[PDB]
Amino acid sequence: EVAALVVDNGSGMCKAGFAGDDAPRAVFPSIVGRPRHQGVGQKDSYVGDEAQSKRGILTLKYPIEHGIVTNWDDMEKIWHHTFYNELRVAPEEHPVLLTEAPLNPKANREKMTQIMFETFNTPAMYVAIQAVLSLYASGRTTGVVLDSGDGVTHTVPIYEGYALPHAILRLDLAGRDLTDYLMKILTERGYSFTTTAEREIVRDIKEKLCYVALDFEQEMATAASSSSLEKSYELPDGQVITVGNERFRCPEAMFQPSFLGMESAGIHETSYNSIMKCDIDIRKDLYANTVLSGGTTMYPGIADRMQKEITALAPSTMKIKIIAPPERKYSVWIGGSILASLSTFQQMWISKQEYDESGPSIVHRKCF
Amino acid sequence: VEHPEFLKAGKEPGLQIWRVEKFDLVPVPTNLYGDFFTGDAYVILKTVQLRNGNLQYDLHYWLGNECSQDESGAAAIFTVQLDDYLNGRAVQHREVQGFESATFLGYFKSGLKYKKGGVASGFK
Numbered sequence: 001e002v003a004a005l006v007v008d009n010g011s012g013m014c015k016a017g018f019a020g021d022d023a024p025r026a027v028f029p030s031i032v033g034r035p036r037h038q039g040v041g042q043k044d045s046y047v048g049d050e051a052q053s054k055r056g057i058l059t060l061k062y063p064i065e066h067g068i069v070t071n072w073d074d075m076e077k078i079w080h081h082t083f084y085n086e087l088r089v090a091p092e093e094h095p096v097l098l099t100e101a102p103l104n105p106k107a108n109r110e111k112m113t114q115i116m117f118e119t120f121n122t123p124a125m126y127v128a129i130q131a132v133l134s135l136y137a138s139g140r141t142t143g144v145v146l147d148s149g150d151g152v153t154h155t156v157p158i159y160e161g162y163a164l165p166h167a168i169l170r171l172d173l174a175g176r177d178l179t180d181y182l183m184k185i186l187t188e189r190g191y192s193f194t195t196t197a198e199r200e201i202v203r204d205i206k207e208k209l210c211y212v213a214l215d216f217e218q219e220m221a222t223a224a225s226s227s228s229l230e231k232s233y234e235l236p237d238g239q240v241i242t243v244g245n246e247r248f249r250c251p252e253a254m255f256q257p258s259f260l261g262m263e264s265a266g267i268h269e270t271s272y273n274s275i276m277k278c279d280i281d282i283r284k285d286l287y288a289n290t291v292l293s294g295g296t297t298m299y300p301g302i303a304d305r306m307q308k309e310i311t312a313l314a315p316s317t318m319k320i321k322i323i324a325p326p327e328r329k330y331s332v333w334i335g336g337s338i339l340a341s342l343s344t345f346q347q348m349w350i351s352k353q354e355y356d357e358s359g360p361s362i363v364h365r366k367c368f
Numbered sequence: 369v370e371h372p373e374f375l376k377a378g379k380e381p382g383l384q385i386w387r388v389e390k391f392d393l394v395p396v397p398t399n400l401y402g403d404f405f406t407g408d409a410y411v412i413l414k415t416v417q418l419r420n421g422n423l424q425y426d427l428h429y430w431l432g433n434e435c436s437q438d439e440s441g442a443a444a445i446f447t448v449q450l451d452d453y454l455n456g457r458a459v460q461h462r463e464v465q466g467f468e469s470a471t472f473l474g475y476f477k478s479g480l481k482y483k484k485g486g487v488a489s490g491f492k
C-alpha cells in the first residue's frame with residue numbers, strides 16, 4: 001500500500017530512497033549553498049550536486065558535522081530538497097525513517113522529530129541508529145560495527161539487537177581527513193592540489209588507487225626499492241602523475257593516527273577496546289562478528305589487515321572474523337529499507353497522533 | 369507488535385518455525401519442519417517448559433546459503449522483535465547453513481535436510 005521513505009543523513013553524503021528498494025535512489029552531497037555575495041543565481045539557495053556545481057557563486061555550508069546536525073535551518077533545506085527534488089514525493093504522504101549517529105544528543109533527536117511532524121507533516125516517522133541498521137543489513141543481531149564515513153569513526157558493540165552505549169568508542173578521523181592527508185603527501189612528490197576540482201581529483205585517486213597494506217613497514221621498504229607498487233593516474237586534461245607509497249600510506253592513517261598527528265589509537269585498537277568494555281560473556285560473539293560499514297572502510301585490503309591486527313590483540317583462542325560486505329557504502333540505508341519494509345514495523349513508527357499527544361519527547365520512548 | 373504469529377509464539381513447550389516471505393513472518397506447515405530451502409531464511413522458536421512454570425526460549429534464525437539480503441536481514445530483525453515481545457527471555461542464535469549449532473541440529477530427530485530453491489527476495 002503505503003510506501004515508507006528511508007533517509008540516511010551523512011556528514012558528507014545523504015542517501016535517500018524508498019523502503020523496499022535494494023538501494024537508495026538519490027545519493028548526493030550534504031551541502032546547502034547560498035549566494036556568495038548579496039547583489040542580483042537564481043533561487044534563494046541550492047542543495048546537493050547543484051550547489052557543488054554552482055559553487056562559483058555560492059558559499060557552501062555542511063549542516064551535519066561528525067554525523068550530528070549543527071544547523072537546523074540548513075538541515076530543513078536539505079530535507080525539503082530530498083523530499084521534493086530528489087525523491088519527488090509529498091512528505092505528508094509517507095512514513096519517514098531517519099538515521100542518526102551513535103550517541104546523538106537527546107535534544108537533537110527531539111528537534112529532528114519536531115521538524116518532521118511540524119514542518120513536513122509526516123504521518124509517521126522513526127529514528128534508527130546507523131550502526132544497528134548496518135548490523136541488521138548483514139543478517140546479524142550481535143556484533144561490533146565499525147562505521148567510518150565522512151565525519152568521525154565509531155565502533156559500536158551490539159548485543160541481541162541493541163547497541164551497548166557504554167562500550168561505544170570513537171576515532172575522530174574519517175574520509176575527509178584521509179582526502180586531506182592524501183592531498184598533502186602528494187605535494188611531497190611535487191604535486192599541488194588545492195582547488196575544489198583538484199581536491200576532487202585527489203578524492204578519486206583515494207577511492208580508486210589506495211589500499212591497506214597487510215604489513216606496512218614492509219610495504220614501505222618494497223616501495224623504496226622498486227616501482228612495483230607505483231601506479232599512474234591520468235589527470236582530467238591528459239597530464240599523468242604517478243602515485244607510489246601514498247596508495248597505502250593514506251589509509252594507513254586509520255591504523256596509525258599519528259600520521260595525522262593524532263595520539264589516538266587506530267581502528268583495530270578502538271575495536272578491540274570497545275569489545276573489552278563489554279561483558280566477558282559476549283566478547284566471543286563480538287570478535288566473530290566485526291562488521292565494517294561506511295565509505296571509508298572501502299579500501300581494498302582493509303578486512304585482511306583488521307583480521308591480522310585484532311588477532312594480535314585478542315587471545316589466540318578467540319576466533320576473529322571481519323565482515324566487509326561489498327555494498328557497505330550503503331549498508332546503513334539498506335538496513336533501513338529492510339526494517340521499514342517489515343510487516344511488524346507498523347506499530348513501531350511514531351504516529352501523528354502520538355506526536356500530537358506527547359510532543360517531541362515521544363522519540364525517547366519509541367526509538368531507543 | 370500485533371502480528372498474528374507473535375500472538376501464537378511461545379505459548380507452550382514445543383518447536384515453532386516460520387519462514388521469511390517478502391518481509392513477513394509466515395508459518396511453515398508442521399509437515400515440512402526440518403526441510404530447509406537454501407534460498408530462504410527462517411526463524412525457529414524452541415520453547416522448553418521450566419520447573420518453575422514459565423517457559424525457556426531459544427530463538428534461532430537460520431540463513432540459507434542463497435537467501436537474499438532482505439531475507440537474512442528480516443530474519444535477524446524478526447528475531448529481535450520476538451525476543452522483545454517475549455520480554456527479552458529468549459537467547460538468540462545465528463544459524464548459518466552448514467554451520468548450525470549442535471543444539472539446533474538436535475531439534476530435528478530425523479536430521480534436518482537442505483533443499484535448493486525457495487521464495488524470491490522482496491526487494492525493488
Ligand SMILES: Nc1ncnc2c1ncn2[C@@H]1O[C@H](COP(=O)(O)OP(=O)(O)OP(=O)(O)O)[C@@H](O)[C@H]1O
Binds near residue numbers: 150296
Ligand atoms: N572506494 C572508496 N575507497 C575509500 N574511500 C571511499 C570510497 N568510496 C567512498 N569513500 C569515502 O567515504 C566517505 C563518504 O562515506 P559515507 O557516505 O559512508 O559517509 P557519511 O555518511 O556521509 O559520513 P558519516 O557517517 O561520518 O556521517 C568520503 O570521504 C569518500 O571519499
Ligand SMILES: [Ca+2]
Binds near residue numbers: 434439487
Ligand atoms: Ca529466497
Ligand SMILES: [Mg+2]
Binds near residue numbers: 332
Ligand atoms: Mg554515514
